[PDB]
């Protein structure tokens, strides 16, 4: 019952209005070599969305350090967006530094498959991870009642960038995979003789010709990804509500 | 470029062949009062998929504890399913206990929008979380080169179940949200009169009339959810590859 | 070019969400035997719109006295609507007492033809005047750059009601028409025998058989109407910006 | 429902016969650097129409002073037009100086959406305000039983011309707005940086970053606009029915 | 019903993924001057299919000696294909030396009409014999429950190459036809003058003008064809299940 | 390409004219509890087709013994069929006992997909093996220049009937399969528990859980199947063109 | 109903296979400056067709004297055609010397409208008379149960060649017409002036302006045409079956 | 290029206007148990047509003795028909006793395929022979320039009637066939058994099993048919133009 962009496709080319100005996607980021996370939320001045924006805002320099920009999206106007950002800066003490797309009318939402059956009016919490070639790498659709785990989005982009750069695939649960730890997977042979050569070379640890891996990620890349997960798992000492 | 079922919709009724036999979905689970997680993977005997199956299998009791069943899917035949399961039991030491649908041909995959642009032949790594009423609550689409974080799937279903029984929306990163920690959000008033009565009642902690929260989840519930994130953030003591 | 409801047609039956609750139009007002003025504005937190809401809000008793209710509309959500009404009340000292419809995808706006070419995203400043039977009696489309004259909406309503209750047409600029002042027009004869009988009747003041009038409105109806124009023409004693 | 040209669109191009000749719209007026107000009325030798034509003829010079021309329209033929103008001139003593379109087949009225459900055969009292670029700036649809307030069409064109030349939006009830009086609105910033800069400059009177205004209009322009309202509110010292 | 390519058409051009690598069909073999037999099986790790691969494997050299390559096809992935090859080599002791196309999704199978009504998901046991021009010369469709007689496929290939080169048609059951034995048939005259001339040449053994034959095939070519049948008819002494 | 009926479908219902009378297929044979082999030939009085009629006529008793009726088909008329059958009887000494459908116009041939690309005018040499329920069980398309090996049609029929009554699949080259000889195959388990069950029962000879077999066919059934192959391999003792 | 080529149209350009080789109609004959009679018969080895072939073969020289060739047509193959010609030459003693098109599939028959109700499989007995410009001059459709009168086809071609060369129309039953004998008709005048000039020219015998005739055909041409009817009317002195 | 009814179809049901009154056709004749010959001519007052109508009129008795009625057809009106029949009676001395259809407009003509390429306005010389069941049995299309041989039409109806009643096919130019004279053909056997029974019934003279014949027509029938041919061949001793 809905149409969406797909992984592996180029992000739909579109000019959008954001509270930082009009920008062209995915070009604005591709031209800078940036990946970007475009995420949507149902409405400004709604609570789960406010928690998610504060959580992205607090992790903004983690994204910037990976070369990833952030961009939000909802059916509200840019006026609402600014007003909501001022409310947030004023009452929660957190400045939201990235743009939010305003698409009253839902043109962008439809194009991205963000209006689901829970609401005909507001988008769900989708998240698109797009690489520096403009290519959709991952898509997540959370519902209106459940905020996202923003550290898993950091883990996803960190792991995709690493995989791309090291030409490896990433095991489930990685930095902490139960079979190979922080090891990374060598893409499986796709021919018989490549399989045979890989087993002949003895270059990797392997469980079978289609299951070879090594540990080429730097200790800093592994620690950084593990740090996102430890952050997700750690209860903050001091809530910003108290502070407010 | 791809059509998908949507959150809030009933899972597409269908009969599917799994390596445990034919089952009708969502009925097989709805009749039992159970939720289910249907997840797909590109291919039997490929490594990220094997790490993911092991991760789901080792967390199977956690899904059972929540009344959630797991069912996998790929375009391989039930015979490859069975031989791949044997190989995992034999070389990694873990038995996969749940069914895998086999859809050579991609009939099921196409109905669920699991074939993306990354591969014309194998599905991406999608995940549908479906409640005991047959309704899709969340959908995730990870790519072929990156395993999922199974603990977040546990966190999602645990949080959706809590929000459903307590009538509360769940903040970003719950139960470690940075604004209200493990608090849960009272869905926002949608009318002025409702906004005013809520501020007047004084029955919730509040940042504004649209941001009210309280802490109705039991310590057990919060800690179970935080325990999934802690496990994810924890480096394994010993790797299954070593003991194998 | 756009499609719109027409004068003489029953307002399009629709359920809408406003910041006072879901109501069905035109039923909600017809059921109360109330005429209503539905008006739209491009966006909450935008200045001309704010001046129009305060102007409508300050003339609300004048619409109540007629039996007319007011309802606004923009593509913003109800949450923005309530925050915006809180802002006006806090900074301008005027409470907006009527509902505002939230139409974030333009559904209502498309039905009413409120999306013009000045903006693909925000509605123009439309006004539909609807009588207690649900019929569209007048439609005005002002642009985004120009605020309405709310006293001319009162004059319209007052005159339509008077014309309906006295079976009279209302001359240009009534009750200060330059030919007949506060006189009201007798619907012209449509047959030759009616035209003849009207002339032999000697009952109205008349310029020709198709141009007869009298003065059946009461001094109250006449001075009420003129009072709206006198208020429009008057320089405000004190501006709301000074005590703001 | 019916279809209508929209604010912001070029006025439909079409040749039209008027009782001054054939002309091409909007070209005739665009060619002359003129804005024009095209208005319709249901029928020649009908009383409310005759009052409106008299009211427009009386204010014609006020329209010309603004660089604005008037053109009528009804389904009558040019012969009826000329006969009706003679009749007005003879019995009311007013010469109607501007052209009226004769549109016997409803071709023009259907391009303009002027046939509503109140009559299948005669147009409502529609008003297009078209600027010198041939672009529709405002559309009012009065019904057949209610004559228009011609001073409000002069205020709208004067306000539109002023806001275009001063780059300002016009508040409700200008020049007598209740919040800022004859103050004009600076169109709102649409990005955070613009908002910040607007407020940092301290160059405008302001209630919020999206609500700034100043008083750039000439004392003569404001007085003229107020004069249209004072005239509208003032009862004529003597009625034309009295000499006639 | 279903759509199939046809004898005498060019084998459908297609790039195909095999367990030896991506190859382009007709072309890969056409470019080397080789014929190829493309055959399909419903599923790796299924018993009839295994017997067929082992039977093709055992006759590999017979097809290589005729210049004919072998290529398999199923809807399984290349990873299943290679594990199944490994399983056959390991438990039967036979190495399958030719490629198998992996067609999950059934794209190649739809194009060759290999999906019949006996299974909506797996291919029947098709067989396409394609000459060095890339032309389909014979198509056989066995069902899932019945293994092929591979020696009849070598007889088909051998006979087709012999007839192409001797410019002869081949009688039923050649080289053991009950009427003419290892005789080969001269294509019948299609005109009266040719029939008459043929009958006058006295050059062929003949039963009638449209039934002439001779014995152009060499004794080694005859014996080779007969050796395939003798092999098909001989009970193997020593079954590979016992040996294994 | 061309359309064909598929294995597993009910043979297309049709009334056909044969040189034995009009009959309705498949009903005519189903109502007698008989399977039938329907084969086509390009043209009466052409040599390969003559050799194929004589070979089928010679095996007629072998086909009837299997419960199988033979039916031919070509685009010729029934009068050609009868003259050709007299010619065969008179010059070769063999009486053809089964009917031949006459399909001038090629209506039956287009339904069966018997018109391929090497002749726009005559059918290829197709073979449909139809069981006693009217179901197409195998389809073979031989080209015009190569006659069929009729003993392999007998082997096919025989093995299909044996597999149907013993509920067994037939290995490649049966009764002389190189791995299991005249054993037959138990259809593989399709579920994990069915596989474990099979393997735990100890009831079949086995190479793996999906490769079990046994020797359930009678000595006479196996020897009959082997006789067809011995015959195909044996050079006839006296050629029929000799006595003739 | 069925569709046919029409008199006055060029015969359908087509390439056809005849038992004398392939030819292109109408070109093969137009190139030679010959007319041709194409006629069809239902089926070789059928009695009425055999008698028609014989009658056409016995009159072959009469067609060649006129520069007319003959080609026949049925849906049988060139092989049937040749075997049937042999039968006729051997049992009746008559060699059929002209080509027969073989049209299995009925492609030529359908373009010529030769498949009528009566038989869905064999053509009717049609005849096209086609002149040396390739134009269809006459068409006759006899049925399957009634042989044609070949002498009337000779009369038709003779009469047409005569009317073409002498520019005359031919009366009914010519050369034995009961009103003007072997007289030939001048095409009637089509204007009043032409009528008047014709009658006053005194150049033709005449019954009225529209019925003028003379006798320009040579006694030879008249006698030759009457001789075909005398032959038709003549009882044969010896029957071919007696010496046959 | 043209659509015509076919032999073996029921003549198209149609109400036609004739100069004898309106009748309904196939019915009006079928009602009487009569066959009919409907023939067309291009135009009244045209010469070949007149000679054909005279030729039919002189043979009317012969057709009536056979139970055959005649009906003409052209695009002229019934007034032209009656006038032309008067001219014929008056100038030729022959009364035309049968109806002629008038189809100005050509509705009947298009339905019978009578408008060929030779003329877009007047029909060709069509002849339909329709039996007492209303079935079209023979169709002839002669062109404008060539009148028909009416004795051949008698010969066809007599032969078709004899063939129907004696259950025989009629040889080429019967009563004078060169092979069998006035012999009539037995419809060929269509099955092998029927052929063999034929050859053993010994009831008929025979050249082969598909060529048997009888002499069942009485001498009177044979002679009446031969008389139609003798009359065609005979030049009339005195021409009607003579006494005209």
Swiss-Prot record, chains A, B, C, D, E, F, G, H:
Binding-site residues, substrate: 125
Described purpose of this protein according to its UniProt entry: Thiol-specific peroxidase that catalyzes the reduction of hydrogen peroxide and organic hydroperoxides to water and alcohols, respectively. Plays a role in cell protection against oxidative stress by detoxifying peroxides.
Misc: The active site is a conserved redox-active cysteine residue, the peroxidatic cysteine (C(P)), which makes the nucleophilic attack on the peroxide substrate. The peroxide oxidizes the C(P)-SH to cysteine sulfenic acid (C(P)-SOH), which then reacts with another cysteine residue, the resolving cysteine (C(R)), to form a disulfide bridge. The disulfide is subsequently reduced by an appropriate electron donor to complete the catalytic cycle.
Entry's Gene Ontology cellular component terms: cytosol
Catalytic activity: a hydroperoxide + [thioredoxin]-dithiol = an alcohol + [thioredoxin]-disulfide + H2O
Annotated SUPFAM superfamilies: Thioredoxin-like (SSF52833)
Induction trigger: Up-regulated by hydrogen peroxide (at protein level).
PANTHER family, sorted: ALKYL HYDROPEROXIDE REDUCTASE C, THIOREDOXIN PEROXIDASE
Disulphide bridges: 206-212
UniProt domain Thioredoxin: residue ranges: 5-162
The protein's assembly and partners: Homodecamer. Pentamer of dimers that assemble into a ring structure.
Enzyme class: oxidoreductase
GO-annotated molecular function: antioxidant activity; identical protein binding; peroxiredoxin activity; thioredoxin peroxidase activity
Main location: cytoplasm
PROSITE patterns: THIOREDOXIN_2
Keyword Nucleus applies: no
Protein name: Peroxiredoxin
Active site: 49 (cysteine sulfenic acid (-soh) intermediate)
Enzyme Commission code(s) on record: 1.11.1.24
CDD domains per the UniProt record, alphabetical: PRX_1cys
Record key words, sorted: Antioxidant, Cytoplasm, Disulfide bond, Oxidoreductase, Peroxidase, Redox-active center
One GO BP: cellular response to hydrogen peroxide
């Amino acid at each position: 019952p809905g149409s969406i962009p797909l992984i592996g496709e180029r992000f739909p080319e579109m000019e959008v209005t954001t509270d930082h100005g009009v920008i062209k996607l995915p070009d604005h980021y591709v031209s800078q070599g940036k990946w970007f996370v475009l995420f949507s939320h149902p409405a400004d001045f709604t609570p789960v969305c406010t928690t998610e924006f504060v959580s992205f805002a607090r992790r903004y320099e983690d994204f910037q350090r990976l070369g990833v920009d952030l961009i939000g999206l909802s059916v509200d106007s840019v006026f609402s967006h600014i007003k909501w950002k001022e409310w947030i800066e004023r009452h929660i003490g957190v400045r939201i530094p990235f743009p939010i797309i305003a698409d009253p009318q839902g043109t962008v939402a439809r194009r991205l498959g963000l209006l689901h059956a829970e609401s005909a009016t507001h988008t769900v919490r989708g998240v698109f991870i797009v690489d520096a070639r403009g290519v959709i790498r991952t898509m997540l659709y959370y519902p209106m009642e459940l905020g996202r785990l923003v550290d898993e989005i950091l883990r996803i982009v960190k792991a995709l960038k690493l995989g791309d750069s090291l030409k490896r695939a990433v095991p489930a649960d990685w930095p902490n995979n139960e079979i190979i730890g922080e090891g990374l997977i060598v893409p499986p042979p796709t021919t018989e003789d490549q399989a045979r050569a890989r087993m002949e070379s003895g270059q990797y640890r392997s469980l079978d010709w289609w299951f070879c891996w090594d540990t080429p990620a730097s200790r800093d890349d592994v620690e950084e990804a593990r740090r996102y997960l430890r952050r997700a798992a750690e209860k903050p000492a001091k809530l910003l509500y108290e502070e407010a």
